[PDB]
Structure formats: C-alpha cells, structure tokens
Amino acid sequence: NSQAVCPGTLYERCEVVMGNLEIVLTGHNADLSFLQWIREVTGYVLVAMNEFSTLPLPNLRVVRGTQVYDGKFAIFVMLNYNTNSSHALRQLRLTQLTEILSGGVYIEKNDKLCHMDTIDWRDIVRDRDAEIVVKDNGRSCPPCHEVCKGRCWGPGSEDCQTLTKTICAPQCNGHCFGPNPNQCCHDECAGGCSGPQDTDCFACRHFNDSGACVPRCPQPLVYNKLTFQLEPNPHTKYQYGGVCVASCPHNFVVDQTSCVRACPPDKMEVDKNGLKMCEPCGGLCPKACEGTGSGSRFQTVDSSNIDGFVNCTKILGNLDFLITGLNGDPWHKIPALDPEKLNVFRTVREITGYLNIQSWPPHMHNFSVFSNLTTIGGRSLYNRGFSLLIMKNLQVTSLGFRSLKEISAGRIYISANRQLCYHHSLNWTKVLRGPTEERLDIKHNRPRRDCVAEGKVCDPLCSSGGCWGPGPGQCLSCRNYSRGGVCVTHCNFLNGEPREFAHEAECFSCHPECQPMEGTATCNGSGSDTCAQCAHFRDGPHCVSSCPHGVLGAKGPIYKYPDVQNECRPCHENCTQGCKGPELQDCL
Amino acid sequence: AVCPGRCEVVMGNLEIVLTGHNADLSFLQWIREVTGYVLVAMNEFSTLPLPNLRVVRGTQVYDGKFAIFVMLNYNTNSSHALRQLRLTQLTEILSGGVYIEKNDKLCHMDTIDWRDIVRDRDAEIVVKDNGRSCPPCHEVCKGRCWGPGSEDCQTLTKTICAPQCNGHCFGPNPNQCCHDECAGGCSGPQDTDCFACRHFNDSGACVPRCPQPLVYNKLTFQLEPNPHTKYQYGGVCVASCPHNFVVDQTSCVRACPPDKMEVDKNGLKMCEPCGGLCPKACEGTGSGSRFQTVDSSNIDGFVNCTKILGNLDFLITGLNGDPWHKIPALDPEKLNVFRTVREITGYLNIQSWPPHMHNFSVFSNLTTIGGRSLYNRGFSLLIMKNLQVTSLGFRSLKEISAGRIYISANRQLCYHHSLNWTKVLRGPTEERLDIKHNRPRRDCVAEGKVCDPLCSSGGCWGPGPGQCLSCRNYSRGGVCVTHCNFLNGEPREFAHEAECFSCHPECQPMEGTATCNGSGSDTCAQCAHFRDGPHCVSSCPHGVLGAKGP
Numbered sequence A: 001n002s003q004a005v006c007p008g009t010l011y012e013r014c015e016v017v018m019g020n021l022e023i024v025l026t027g028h029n030a031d032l033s034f035l036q037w038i039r040e041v042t043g044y045v046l047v048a049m050n051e052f053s054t055l056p057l058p059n060l061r062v063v064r065g066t067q068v069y070d071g072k073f074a075i076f077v078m079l080n081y082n083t084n085s086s087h088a089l090r091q092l093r094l095t096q097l098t099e100i101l102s103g104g105v106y107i108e109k110n111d112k113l114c115h116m117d118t119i120d121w122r123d124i125v126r127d128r129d130a131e132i133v134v135k136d137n138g139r140s141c142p143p144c145h146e147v148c149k150g151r152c153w154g155p156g157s158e159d160c161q162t163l164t165k166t167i168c169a170p171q172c173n174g175h176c177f178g179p180n181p182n183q184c185c186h187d188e189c190a191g192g193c194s195g196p197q198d199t200d201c202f203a204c205r206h207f208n209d210s211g212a213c214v215p216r217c218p219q220p221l222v223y224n225k226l227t228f229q230l231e232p233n234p235h236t237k238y239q240y241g242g243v244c245v246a247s248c249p250h251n252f253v254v255d256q257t258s259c260v261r262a263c264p265p266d267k268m269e270v271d272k273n274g275l276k277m278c279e280p281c282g283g284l285c286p287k288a289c290e291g292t293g294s295g296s297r298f299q300t301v302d303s304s305n306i307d308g309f310v311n312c313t314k315i316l317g318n319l320d321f322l323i324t325g326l327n328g329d330p331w332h333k334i335p336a337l338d339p340e341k342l343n344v345f346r347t348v349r350e351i352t353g354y355l356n357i358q359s360w361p362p363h364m365h366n367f368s369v370f371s372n373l374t375t376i377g378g379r380s381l382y383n384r385g386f387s388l389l390i391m392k393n394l395q396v397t398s399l400g401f402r403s404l405k406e407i408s409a410g411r412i413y414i415s416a417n418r419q420l421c422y423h424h425s426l427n428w429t430k431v432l433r434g435p436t437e438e439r440l441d442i443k444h445n446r447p448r449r450d451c452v453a454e455g456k457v458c459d460p461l462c463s464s465g466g467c468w469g470p471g472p473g474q475c476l477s478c479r480n481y482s483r484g485g486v487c488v489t490h491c492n493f494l495n496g497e498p499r500e501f502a503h504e505a506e507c508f509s510c511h512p513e514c515q516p517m518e519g520t521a522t523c524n525g526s527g528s529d530t531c532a533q534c535a536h537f538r539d540g541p542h543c544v545s546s547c548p549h550g551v552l553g554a555k556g557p558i559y560k561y562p563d564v565q566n567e568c569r570p571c572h573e574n575c576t577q578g579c580k581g582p583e584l585q586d587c588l
Numbered sequence B: 001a002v003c004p005g006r007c008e009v010v011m012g013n014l015e016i017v018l019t020g021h022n023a024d025l026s027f028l029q030w031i032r033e034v035t036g037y038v039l040v041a042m043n044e045f046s047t048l049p050l051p052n053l054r055v056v057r058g059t060q061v062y063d064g065k066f067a068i069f070v071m072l073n074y075n076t077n078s079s080h081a082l083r084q085l086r087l088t089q090l091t092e093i094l095s096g097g098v099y100i101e102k103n104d105k106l107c108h109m110d111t112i113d114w115r116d117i118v119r120d121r122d123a124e125i126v127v128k129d130n131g132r133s134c135p136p137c138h139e140v141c142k143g144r145c146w147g148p149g150s151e152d153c154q155t156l157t158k159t160i161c162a163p164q165c166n167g168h169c170f171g172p173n174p175n176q177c178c179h180d181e182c183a184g185g186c187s188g189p190q191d192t193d194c195f196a197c198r199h200f201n202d203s204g205a206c207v208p209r210c211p212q213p214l215v216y217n218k219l220t221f222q223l224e225p226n227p228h229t230k231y232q233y234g235g236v237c238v239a240s241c242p243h244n245f246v247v248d249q250t251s252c253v254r255a256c257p258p259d260k261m262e263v264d265k266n267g268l269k270m271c272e273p274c275g276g277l278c279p280k281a282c283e284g285t286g287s288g289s290r291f292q293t294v295d296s297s298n299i300d301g302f303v304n305c306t307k308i309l310g311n312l313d314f315l316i317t318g319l320n321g322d323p324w325h326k327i328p329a330l331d332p333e334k335l336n337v338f339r340t341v342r343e344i345t346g347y348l349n350i351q352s353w354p355p356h357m358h359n360f361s362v363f364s365n366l367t368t369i370g371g372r373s374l375y376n377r378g379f380s381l382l383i384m385k386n387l388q389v390t391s392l393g394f395r396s397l398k399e400i401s402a403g404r405i406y407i408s409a410n411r412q413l414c415y416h417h418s419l420n421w422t423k424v425l426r427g428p429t430e431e432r433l434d435i436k437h438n439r440p441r442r443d444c445v446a447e448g449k450v451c452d453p454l455c456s457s458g459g460c461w462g463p464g465p466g467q468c469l470s471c472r473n474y475s476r477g478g479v480c481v482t483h484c485n486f487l488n489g490e491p492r493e494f495a496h497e498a499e500c501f502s503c504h505p506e507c508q509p510m511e512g513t514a515t516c517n518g519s520g521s522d523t524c525a526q527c528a529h530f531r532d533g534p535h536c537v538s539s540c541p542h543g544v545l546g547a548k549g550p
C-alpha cells in the first residue's frame, strides 16, 4: 500500500524522498524516468557534473531543506557540461516547483542551461533572507513562450512558471491561499495552500497521513470509552520522517511510534507476530561472548582476556578459572588477575558448556559473582564428563549460585573444598537433569558435622530442597511464600504494608491505587481493576490517580471529571480543555 | 631439553590433578628441574615417578607457602591410592615449603628430613595424616626413605658451613665453598658443580648471563655478530628459541612487547622496534563493507591505523550527519585519526571536506594508493567539488598503483597545475586524468600560489618547501633546502643522494671544512675526545668487554 517514501543516499513510484536527492557524475544516456513521481524532497537537490540534457522532475512540488548544501542552498545545480563535446544539461523541467521551505537556490556555470534567468525564484523560496545565485549559464537561450509571461522552465507553452504566492492578510502570518482575511491556510501547513483544509497544503508542518496534514500520526494506544483504558490501535501508523506510514520501509524496524534503522542501545529487536519492533531490555541487553577452554584457545580466564566479558549475559562455550590465570604467569608474564574484575561475571545468566573453578581469590568466600547464573548447559564437558567442577577451593564457605535452576547435562564435581558448607542438604535432582544415578563426585569438603555444629545449615524458611548459603535468599525454594526471591513467612493479605496478593507461591504488591482495606483482602491481583476499593478516583472499572484529561481517543481527546462519588464522567459535549463538572459553566 | 608446565626442565609449575590410576606418567622420567612448584592432588595412581627431579625453585609457590603440595590422593570406594613419592634424587627446594597431608595410603613421608631439602629456614613443613601401617625403611637408608627398597634412601645434603661460605658449601672446610653462581649447594667449587643455577645455565655452566649478541673484535676496534651467541629461555641459554617463540632483545618470548614487531631476518625470527607505531590494518569504506561513507559511527575504528584494506569514502551525509536515521555530524578534528595512514589499497574518495580545512593534510603521511579497488569509472583518487580547498597536501604520496585520477570542481584548488602525475601515477599516463574546473592556473600564478622555487620540475602539493614532490638540490627531513650543514651550522651534516644526515655525534665540528663524509664513527675528519683505531669514541673502553674477556 503506497509506500510513497524512499531514502536519499529516488526510485520507481516514490513520491516523497526522505533525505537529499543527489545526482552527480551521471552520463548523458542515464535513464532518469524513475524520478517521475517525486513530489517532495525533504533534503536538498544537488545536480552536478552530469551530461544528460534534461532533468525530468515534472511532479516535484516541494523542497523542504531540512538539510542544505553548502550551508545555504536547497537547490544546487552546478557545472553540468562536458568541454570537448556538446553533451550538457539544457533544461530543468521543474514545472510544478511550488515552494522551498528552507534555504536558497544556486544555479551557476551550467553552460547549456536555459531559462533560469527567467524564474521568479523569490516566489518559490519561503525564506526571505535566503540566497539566490543564478548566473553564468545560458548564453543565447530561446525566449519563453508567449503564454508564460516571461517566466519558464523551457521553451514550450506548458513549461511555464506559475506565481503561487499572494499578499497575506496580517491575520494569516504568510500562510494563505488568497489575499482576503477569509483565506488563511490550515495551521498544519508549512507554506501555502490551495484552500483552508489540512488536505489542501502544499507541504505539512509536522506529519502527513494519506494526504492530510496532522500534528501526530495515529497513535499506538487509544482511549476506549467502553473499556475505560488505553487499547491497541488497529489504525496505528508509524513515523518515517514526517510521513505516517502503515508499515516501515522494509528493513527498518519500529521503536514505539517511530521507524528506525536499528534499535536504541537500551532495547532489542523482538518480532511480534511478524512485526519487527524494539522492546526494552529488562536491565541490560542479551550479549553472548565466546568462553574459555577447548574450542577457544584461552585455556583460562586471565588478566589479559577478562574484559572481553564485560556486559556479557550468555557464554558461548565454557568458563575455566585456573591458578595461572588467577595468580598470573610471571614467566610468559600475564600479570596477576585483579579480583574485583571478577564482578564482570555478575551479569552472566547462561553458560552453554561447563563451569570450572579450580582457583578463587582467597578473600571472596563464595561464588556469588554468579548469583545470576541460571543455566549450565553442559553441551561441552570437562575432564570426566563434568559440567560443573569446583575443586580445591580452600577459602570458600558457600556456593552462592543463588539463581541456578538447571544443569542440563554432565556431572557435578565438588571436592577438596575443605571449608565448604551449605551443600550437604542440597537436593541436586531438582537442579540436575537426566538420570540421577552415577552423577555426583562430592567428597572431602568440610565435614557435615562441622557445618552443623557451627550453625552453617540452611535457613528454616528453605524447603527440604536445600540452600546455596545462609539466609532466606539462598534457598533453592521456599517453604511457603517468597517476596523478591526472598523466602518469607506470609503475605500482607489483611494488614501490613504494602498490601499484597499471592500468585502461585509468590507475594506481589497490590496496585498503588487500591485502598488498603483493614482485615480484608485489598485486591485479587496486580491490576487496578482488581482492588476492593479505589483510593482516589474510579474510571469505569479502573482505580486511577486522576481522571482522564486529554488522553487521545478515536474521535479526538477524552476529558473527564470526578463525580460526587468520585467516579469519572465525561465533560460537556461542548467543551475544549476540560472541566470541573458536568455543567456548561464548568468547562476550560 | 626444556618445556612448559623427554623434558628436563619444567619451566612453570608441574601440576598433576584428577588423573586415573593407570595413566602413563613415564613422560616425566627425566625431569631434572622444576622452576616454581609441584602440585599433586586428587589422583589415583599408585607411584609418582620422578627419579631425576633434583631441584624445585619455587619461583612461583602454592597456597602462598608450598613448593611441594601433595593432597588427597586416594579413592574411597576403591583401593586406588598414592603409595609412593619416588623423589629419590630430590636434593633441594630453593624457595617455599612442603605440604603433604590427607594421603590415606602414602607411606614414608614421616621419615624424610624435609629441613635438609628446604633452603628457606622460615619455610613451612606440614606432613601429617597419611599412610598408617607403613613398612619400615631398609636398614641401609638410616631411617630416611622414599620407599621400602634398599635403593630408595634419602641421603642427607646439607653440611654445617664455614662462615666464609654463607650457606653455600660442598663441605665443612673453608676450602669448600660453592661457586657464587650457585642457587643452593654444589658438589665441588666450580661452575659445573652446582645443583641449580642462580641466574642462567649455559650447556652445564652456571653463568650470570648468556653468550652476548655482540663480541668486541680488535683487528677492527668495533663490536660484532657473535657466532657463539645464545638467547635466554627462562634460565636455559639456547642456540635457537622453541619453535614459535621469537627473540626479543637477548630473550626468548612467545610474542613481542607492544612497541615492536616480528621481522624475519637472517632466516631466524626477531623483534625490532617500530619508531612511531606498529603496522595495524583496518578495513575501509565502500564496496565490500557495511559503510558507504566514513561517519561519526565510523571514525573511531581507525585510531592508530597505518594501512587501509579497501577504500576511504568521505561523503556529505557522513560529514554533516543524517538526521533521518539519526547519525550525527562528524567532529572535524576527529579527522586527524587518518594522519597515521600510510597506505590505501583501493581508492581514496573525497567528495566532502570540513569548510575550515584548506587541504587534505590529514593524509600528509599517505604514501601509497593501491587502486586494488576503483570508484565510479575506474578512479583511484577522486577529489570532487570541495569548494574550500586551497591545496591537496599529499606531502608523502609517491605511488598510485593503478586506475584513474579525478580532480574537478574544487574552486580554490591551486598548486596542482604543475604536478607531474607520471611520477605518482605510473603505467600508461594518457587518458587517466580527469582534472578540470579547479582554480584557473592564471589566477593562481597571479596570487603567488605556485611551487616553492626549491621544488623540482615535478611540482608541489601546496605552498612552501615541504610540499615538494622532489627537491632541486638538497633535502632535510622531507623539507627542501638550499644547503646541508657542510661547513657551518650547529648540527653538522653530510649528503647522501641529496639528503642531509647529521655527522656521528662525536666529530669535533671544525670550521670551513667537511666534518665527515658519512654516518659512521670512522668517517669524521677529526674527533672531539678519543680515537680507537678507525672509530671516534668518548669514554674510552672500561675493560675490553669482548672476544675472550675484559
């Protein structure tokens, strides 16, 4: 459907050129008809070093000049002739050129170019301080046809310039389609017009929706008067420059309400039912890095390679933490790894292969820098089929793999970690997948008894499943409820702050707009249409903080007021910027 | 004879972990020295074969304290376990202590006098909780053994020492001191009698450094290449570096430091200093890339780049920005990033330039346009419609290898009229030049915008002496000049093929006569300070460091 727009740096049925139309160094027999439908060039037009005889831009009506050439020109036409032959630019068939919103005109030194000294350029240029430089071109050019009244883009009777502009009633501020005070141009007009409508503009001040000059494109979300909330808008159009389009140019993508070539750094390209859009990344954006060991040729994380993990959320391959990496290799001198630089791994959620820890800084008592690691794949293993191996780490008290829930394959080796507690009671089968028998080499860590006697056992709120360390937030799963991934004793159902509802075994807060009820449930769920009672105002089913005031519905903006009972009801049918009540006296 | 952690020296730590009971350990037989430490943990083999191991330096140590660390070498539900440490020749441990604990089936470690092997008097020895009903030592071993056999004895090493020897001795007599180049002890007073070398070991001798790269020769009173030279591998002097180590200075390293590069010389790999910076290649702009212009999303990827594989395209949207797809406008100063460029393999293409920059001086180091890719109708160099440019400024451009040259519509471009393109552009000259509609020559002549008189008939890339393609007389630092400092001036000089190089720093500058005919000491007319054969030196030799001793 009429994707009428094209980039500048100008093909088949293009109507608007988003960007500049640059034409340089093209030969005399170039096919230029593909430029036929261009109606608007949002940049500037540059025509230099060519040898074709006629520039066919019959439909070109506006040159917007959002960008200008040489700092001052919306049109720049220079040097279009070969010396040792007579192939040259003879005609600018700009027969419909109606206006130029920004910048001036430079047409100089085109030896066979005629009639450019005839045009009233000040009539086309909207900028009163713009530069017009037309000179040293034609020589002996044939005269304008008798009809054209001394102004033409060519010799023919239909190659005339038409004066467009008229003196404007001081009422209109330059924008008028006649001299009378009646004939002001629509506000959404960049220049002049042929009549008072948003559909009669020569050019749009902000956006263009199927020919209509509008202040915004039809939005993604529209208030629904029967639903009392915003709703998806099936008539949404997105911004490509100043043109509302139904679909983005075909390898553009949508960053809410706009067409862009690639997502911003805080968002990521999701496909929604075949609609390429940009969704916000929950924190940081999915970056995968290749790991360490076999299939890489780092064989350990070290002070030379570590930064190559900054902001990395998925590891393609393995992560090996050997002694030479940690403490340095003075012989092939790799300096000693800075311990704090291990926090770069806090951002890791998946490891595709194995994790392998044979050395750790002695002051760090746990592998808590992997508190966000959820998944060890084990699709490549280490030694005797191990996906997780933790060996001879003498200062480590606890594992601290808070958020680990899946070791997809491989075996688990945790041995010689002589001060290691909290792992004795842990039920690996809830984490470890596949057949359970054969799979555990867990020996010669701290003796269980020692752990028990120092009170280094799981928090009581943990389930029979175990913990990765002391306290509620190290549990594998909670006995009852959890709030913010911390095991807890209850939810704030009938008292307490913030009041909450429970979904599955988690405590979530009620909507901020629900009124805290005393000794009865405040809500069944997260949405403001689930509260027992609104604090503040009710809008249909929804508890809101203040009634709608100018939210865009389908037929204009919606405006409401608070009732006696505080329920939002609509403003008088004959108001504008709102109301304080239903009466006609109450508006604005 | 040496290797990293039939090897004899283990350069690095010897770590043996997680090995099964009948793994072949025989590749360790001959190991004589282990720099740093030995770690033996979590294993299930019955005997650890290190018959020849004599020295453990502990240049790197385990757990902050141990040159030997042997821990937990036994399986519980099988009877696979470490029973013997066959360390029969272990003579000394230069730094660090000994940790042998938790080895359920390891025998005899309670019999060894570790304090006799240990060189550090404050080192930690922790031997505990190992084998339990262990056989006794053979009667011969006098209560000290690494095993049950008569052949498995610990033999003492240390001897109380005459104070002239302070810890380094092969006997109790003052007569019996160890050679100073000895790390620990010895079997005699010589270089060859050491247990381990304090610094370096050359084919058996403990030496303080390896055979030098240069040897003094006084038939010529100069230093020379030495056919008896050797380079440093940790502590082993070798004739050739390990197969893809390379030599930096006198040392073997696996890769050069920053500031230098692998030259293949003599048929043996060395590391030579660069000067400015070291050859970095980057991919360019245009066909074969994601870019159709260098732009501010693009600029930083060129820092410190000497060679461009591909092209360099300087389009207008690239310079002024693209508001439509939100690519901002280039900071003009960030163009200086290209000063470091010496070669462009494909084409250079400048269609837009910052309005305050009057020349392409940012490529003043550009030496070569390859033209291995062309632009438009076969252009190697295209400079078009730059209205602000006075001069090209390709100071150093000497070769455009193939393709055509387009220089047009650069309304104030002077200094290019006189240029002999056939010296820059070779192959057939004719029909390769598209040069028109720049500043007209006449006007240039009239504003005094022509080549310096010092330039040759070849032309210039701008105003002044240092824009010449070639000089009529002499040149100093790519700057044309009238003369070299032959008979006066404070840096005195000589001329080689019309270039001024300083005399060697030692000549006494004297008056109205040539100070030197050449670069080298042995060319001056007459020296300040003192002469040694043909050569000017100051600071007469402090000992003849050379051919056979100082």
Ligand SMILES: *[C@@H]1O[C@H](CO)[C@@H](O[C@@H]2O[C@H](CO)[C@@H](O)[C@H](O)[C@H]2NC(C)=O)[C@H](O)[C@H]1NC(C)=O
Residues within 6 Å of the ligand: A363, A364, A365, A366, A368, A398, A400, A469, A470, A474
């Ligand atoms: C995991 O280890 C870290 C540090 O190794 C522990 O954080 C320390 O907490 C204890 C007591 O509060 C002290 O050693 C320090 O105040 C903390 N050090 C640092 C560097 O934060 C953390 O408590 C451990 N996790 C546990 C025990 O669950």
Ligand SMILES: *[C@@H]1O[C@H](CO)[C@@H](O[C@@H]2O[C@H](CO)[C@@H](O)[C@H](O)[C@H]2NC(C)=O)[C@H](O)[C@H]1NC(C)=O
Residues within 6 Å of the ligand: B356, B357, B358, B359, B361, B391, B393, B462, B463, B464, B467
């Ligand atoms: C090349 O261009 C640079 C800057 O465009 C010139 O340097 C300027 O030289 C003028 C005098 O000719 C000074 O007044 C300016 O202050 C200088 N500015 C900068 C930024 O350098 C340079 O002289 C030009 N000509 C060459 C290199 O031959």
Ligand SMILES: *[C@@H]1O[C@H](CO)[C@@H](O)[C@H](O)[C@H]1NC(C)=O
Residues within 6 Å of the ligand: A002, A004, A015, A016, A039, A040, A201, A202, A203, A204, A208, A209, A210, A211, A212, A243
């Ligand atoms: C808006 O785009 C449409 C394409 O359907 C077309 O009418 C015209 O080129 C544009 N309108 C104006 C006023 O420029």
Ligand SMILES: *[C@@H]1O[C@H](CO)[C@@H](O)[C@H](O)[C@H]1NC(C)=O
Residues within 6 Å of the ligand: A284, A310, A311
């Ligand atoms: C890493 O992400 C953080 C996000 O807060 C950002 O500040 C930083 O620039 C990023 N660094 C790299 C190298 O990606």
Ligand SMILES: *[C@@H]1O[C@H](CO)[C@@H](O)[C@H](O)[C@H]1NC(C)=O
Residues within 6 Å of the ligand: A283, A284, A346, A347, A349, A372
């Ligand atoms: C991991 O936890 C750290 C805590 O500071 C946080 O910066 C990061 O966003 C967390 N990542 C995930 C995936 O939760």
Ligand SMILES: *[C@@H]1O[C@H](CO)[C@@H](O)[C@H](O)[C@H]1NC(C)=O
Residues within 6 Å of the ligand: A427, A429, A430, A464
């Ligand atoms: C561990 O969890 C698994 C799966 O949930 C379960 O089958 C098993 O009974 C649990 N182990 C114990 C000891 O309860």
Ligand SMILES: *[C@@H]1O[C@H](CO)[C@@H](O)[C@H](O)[C@H]1NC(C)=O
Residues within 6 Å of the ligand: A460, A461, A479, A480, A481, A488, A489, A490
């Ligand atoms: C929550 O668990 C706590 C302690 O584990 C216990 O006192 C209580 O009975 C549990 N509550 C519910 C509702 O199961």
Ligand SMILES: *[C@@H]1O[C@H](CO)[C@@H](O)[C@H](O)[C@H]1NC(C)=O
Residues within 6 Å of the ligand: A522, A523, A524, A530, A531, A532, A533
């Ligand atoms: C909460 O639950 C009730 C019944 O349990 C239901 O009518 C509705 O979903 C909610 N009603 C409120 C919060 O008034």
Ligand SMILES: *[C@@H]1O[C@H](CO)[C@@H](O)[C@H](O)[C@H]1NC(C)=O
Residues within 6 Å of the ligand: A573, A574
């Ligand atoms: C505005 O509203 C009334 C009733 O809603 C309607 O008859 C007419 O259009 C207007 N009347 C006024 C402004 O009195």
Ligand SMILES: *[C@@H]1O[C@H](CO)[C@@H](O)[C@H](O)[C@H]1NC(C)=O
Residues within 6 Å of the ligand: B032, B033, B194, B195, B196, B197, B201, B202, B203, B204, B205
């Ligand atoms: C020095 O090197 C020789 C080379 O054969 C070797 O045999 C000898 O044992 C070494 N001596 C040391 C390391 O003290």
Ligand SMILES: *[C@@H]1O[C@H](CO)[C@@H](O)[C@H](O)[C@H]1NC(C)=O
Residues within 6 Å of the ligand: B276, B277, B339, B340, B342, B365
């Ligand atoms: C290029 O010139 C700059 C001048 O500052 C210098 O840094 C660089 O070393 C030069 N490169 C070459 C190859 O001479």
Ligand SMILES: *[C@@H]1O[C@H](CO)[C@@H](O)[C@H](O)[C@H]1NC(C)=O
Residues within 6 Å of the ligand: B277, B303, B304
């Ligand atoms: C570029 O070279 C300079 C000069 O040695 C150095 O200081 C800088 O770190 C280098 N930067 C990059 C990105 O290569």
Ligand SMILES: *[C@@H]1O[C@H](CO)[C@@H](O)[C@H](O)[C@H]1NC(C)=O
Residues within 6 Å of the ligand: B420, B422, B423, B457
């Ligand atoms: C240009 O240089 C070459 C040799 O360097 C010479 O053949 C030619 O004559 C020169 N051009 C002119 C105009 O002399």
Ligand SMILES: *[C@@H]1O[C@H](CO)[C@@H](O)[C@H](O)[C@H]1NC(C)=O
Residues within 6 Å of the ligand: B472, B473, B482, B483
């Ligand atoms: C350099 O050459 C020119 C012409 O060949 C000559 O006139 C001039 O005197 C020379 N300069 C010197 C210092 O000899």
Ligand SMILES: *[C@@H]1O[C@H](CO)[C@@H](O)[C@H](O)[C@H]1NC(C)=O
Residues within 6 Å of the ligand: B517, B518, B523
């Ligand atoms: C000085 O050097 C030049 C060129 O190498 C040579 O012609 C001349 O004979 C030399 N004279 C002496 C005394 O070395």
